[PDB]
């Protein structure tokens, strides 16, 4: 059935401080010893699409991989047909086109009364034999910040009987990412996100996203 493209618009809303990090050139001058990745122009916290893609793939590797995934190249057919796989014929390019995530409530944050869009979390480590506390500082994209999340799944004539399984995979990836962290030191209360206004709309071509939206939202 003919070409189609389906876009999963959503609003990532950090419930806990996000620390995707990765200061290289611009964010490298942050004077924090762990700056969050920012926009080079507006100095705004950004959730790169690579983080979302990698975290979703690693999360779905624990559900839709019957064999043990020693390498991402040895992933199951379902995962490699969406996220791609460099070492096979049919699955060389995946069906998922992730996009970066930019701050969308900066004006709302100004209205609330914030001065900066990235707080500084102070932590420390306690030695076990001695008890001297070694302190440290790490940046955190403050909570209640929204990012525009936009993922497109392509529907091709040849890959048509696998649409429902793929849709279940995106659902199970987005709702696993809502349960696990999103980058950063997540095992210490970090990177907790939530996808608000989770809505799928066909954009190019035509498809019955009306059956998908009802099973996407709520349940």
């Amino acid at each position: 059935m003919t070409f189609a493209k389906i876009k999963f618009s959503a609003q990532i809303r950090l419930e806990t401080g996000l620390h995707i990090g990765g200061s290289d050139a611009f964010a490298a001058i942050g004077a924090i010893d762990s700056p969050v990745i920012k926009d080079p122009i507006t100095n705004l916290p950004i959730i790169p699409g690579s983080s979302l893609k990698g975290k979703m793939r690693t999360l779905l590797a624990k559900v839709y991989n019957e064999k043990v995934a020693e390498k991402p190249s040895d992933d199951s057919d379902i995962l490699s047909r969406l996220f791609g796989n460099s070492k096979d014929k049919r699955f060389k390019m995946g069906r998922l086109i992730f996009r970066d995530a930019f701050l969308s409530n900066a004006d709302e944050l100004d209205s609330l009364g914030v001065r900066s869009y990235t707080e500084v979390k102070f932590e420390n480590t306690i030695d076990r034999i001695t008890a001297e506390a070694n302190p440290r500082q790490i940046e955190r994209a403050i909570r209640n910040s929204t990012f525009d999340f936009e993922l497109i799944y392509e529907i091709t004539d040849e890959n048509e009987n696998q649409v429902e399984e793929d849709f279940k995979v995106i659902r199970d990836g987005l709702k696993l990412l809502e349960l696990d962290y999103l980058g950063g030191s997540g095992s210490r209360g970090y990177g907790k996100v939530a996808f608000e206004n989770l809505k799928a709309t066909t954009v190019f071509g035509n498809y019955d996203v009306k059956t998908l939206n009802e099973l996407l939202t709520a349940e």
Binding site: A31, I32, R115, S116, V120, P135, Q137
Partner: peptide, 17 residues
């Protein structure tokens, strides 16, 4: 001590803003 050295980050943040 540590507190004065930590105040450098607040100084830098005030300088930038």
């Amino acid at each position: 001590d540590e507190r004065g050295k930590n105040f450098i980050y607040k100084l830098i943040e005030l300088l930038r803003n």
